[PDB]
Amino acid sequence: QRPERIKTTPYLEGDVLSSDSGPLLSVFALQEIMQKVRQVQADYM
Amino acid sequence: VDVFIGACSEPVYRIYNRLQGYIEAVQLQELRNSIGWLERLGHRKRITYSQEVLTDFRRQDTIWVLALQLPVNPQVVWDVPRSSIANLIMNIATCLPTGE
Amino acid sequence: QIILDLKIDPGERMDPAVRMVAGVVGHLLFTAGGRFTNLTQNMARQLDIALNDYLLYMYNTRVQVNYGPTGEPLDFQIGRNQYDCNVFRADFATGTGYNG
Amino acid sequence: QIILDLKIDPGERMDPAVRMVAGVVGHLLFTAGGRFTNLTQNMARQLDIA
Amino acid sequence: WATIDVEYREPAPYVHAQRYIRYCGIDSRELINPTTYGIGMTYHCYNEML
Amino acid sequence: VYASELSVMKVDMRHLSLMQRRFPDVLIQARPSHFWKAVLNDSPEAVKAVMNLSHSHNFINIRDMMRWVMLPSLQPSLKLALEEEAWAAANDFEDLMLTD
Amino acid sequence: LLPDLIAGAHQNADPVVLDVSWISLWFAFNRSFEPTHRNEMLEVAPLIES
Sorted by sequence, the CB contacts under 8 Å of residue B18 that are 6+ apart come out as: F81, F82, F85
CA distance D43 to D29: 13
Strands of the sheet with C76-78, listed across from one edge: C65-67, C76-78, C83-84
Which DSSP state fits C65?
E
CA nearest to F95, candidates B12, C1, B28: B12
Output the DSSP codes for D3-47.
Answer: -B-----TT----HHHHHHHHHHHHHH--EETTEESB-HHHHHHH
Contact (CB<8Å) C57/E9 = no
User: Is the CB of residue F54 less than 8 Å from the CB of residue B85?
Assistant: yes
Sorted by sequence, the CB contacts under 8 Å of residue E24 that are 6+ apart come out as: E3, E43, E46
- State how beta strands G16-20 and C2-6 pair: parallel
CA distance C98 to C90: 8
Rounded to 5 degrees, what are φ and ψ at B32?
Answer: -65, -45
CA distance B30 to B43: 20
Can you name the residues that pair with C96 across neighbouring β-strands?
C91
CA distance C53 to C23: 9
Max CA separation in chain E (angstroms): 41
Chain C residue closest in CA terms to E12: C71
B contact residues 31-60, partner G, Cβ 8 Å cutoff: 52, 55-57, 59-60
Task: Give the A:B interface size as CB pairs under 8 Å.
Answer: 13
CA-CA-CA-CA torsion sign (F45, F80, B22, F89): positive
DSSP H or E run through B69: none
Contact (CB<8Å) G39/A32 = no
Note whether C35 contacts B: Cβ–Cβ < 8 A.
no
Note whether B86 contacts E: Cβ–Cβ < 8 A.
no
- Nearest by CB: B48 against C40, C46, C73: C46
Contact (CB<8Å) A22/G39 = yes
CA-CA-CA-CA torsion sign (F14, F18, F20, F23): negative
Sorted by sequence, the CB contacts under 8 Å of residue C80 that are 6+ apart come out as: C63, C64
The CA–CA distances, whole Å, from F20 to B15, C7, E1, E8 equal 27, 59, 60, 50
CA nearest to B57, candidates G25, C9, A39: A39
User: If you compute the radius of gyration of chain E from its CA atoms, what whole number of angstroms results?
Assistant: 14
G17/chain B closest Cα distance in angstroms:
6
User: Is the CB of residue C77 less than 8 Å from the CB of residue C65?
Assistant: yes
CA distance C86 to E3: 30
CA distance E20 to E7: 5
Chain B residue closest in CA terms to F77: B68
Which DSSP state fits G15?
P
CA distance D50 to D14: 12
CA nearest to C62, candidates D3, E40, D4, D7: E40
Sorted by sequence, the CB contacts under 8 Å of residue B99 that are 6+ apart come out as: none
D36/chain C closest Cα distance in angstroms:
23
Q: Per-residue b/e over A22-43, b at no fewer than 16 CB within 10 Å?
A: eeeeeeeeeeeeeebeeebeee
Contact (CB<8Å) G32/A17 = no
Which DSSP state fits B73?
P
CA distance C79 to C65: 7
Instruction: Give G-chain residues touching A5 at CB under 8 angstroms.
Output: 34
User: Is the CB of residue C35 less than 8 Å from the CB of residue C100?
Assistant: yes
Note whether D45 contacts C: Cβ–Cβ < 8 A.
yes
Instruction: Give C-chain residues touching D42 at CB under 8 angstroms.
Output: 60-61
Rounded to 5 degrees, what are φ and ψ at G22?
Answer: -75, -45
CA distance C37 to C25: 16
Alpha carbon dihedral F24, F29, F34, F39, in 10-degree steps, equals -20
CA distance C89 to C85: 8
Q: How was this structure determined?
A: cryo-EM
User: Is the CB of residue B81 less than 8 Å from the CB of residue C34?
Assistant: no
The CA–CA distances, whole Å, from D29 to A25, B27, D50 equal 60, 72, 15
Contact (CB<8Å) G26/C7 = no
DSSP H or E run through A2: none
Instruction: Give B-chain residues touching C40 at CB under 8 angstroms.
Output: 55
CA-CA-CA-CA torsion sign (A25, A31, A35, A36): positive
E4/chain D closest Cα distance in angstroms:
27
Instruction: Give E-chain residues touching C57 at CB under 8 angstroms.
Output: 30-31, 33
Contact (CB<8Å) E13/B78 = no
CA distance B12 to F39: 23
Instruction: Give F-chain residues touching B22 at CB under 8 angstroms.
Output: 78, 81
Residue type, F13: M
Instruction: Give D-chain residues touching C61 at CB under 8 angstroms.
Output: 42, 45-46
CA nearest to C78, candidates C47, C51, C55, C61: C55
In a 3-state reduction of DSSP, which class is residue B21?
A: helix
- Nearest by CB: G31 against A5, A17, A22: A17
User: Is the CB of residue C16 less than 8 Å from the CB of residue C54?
Assistant: no
Burial, B99: exposed, middle or buried (Cβ in 10 Å; 0-12, 13-18, 19+)? exposed
Distance of CA C9 to the CA centre of its chain: 21
Output the DSSP codes for F18-75.
Answer: THHHH-TTTSTT--HHHHHHHHHHTS-HHHHHHHHHHHTTS---HHHHHHHHT-----
User: Is the CB of residue F13 less than 8 Å from the CB of residue F80?
Assistant: no
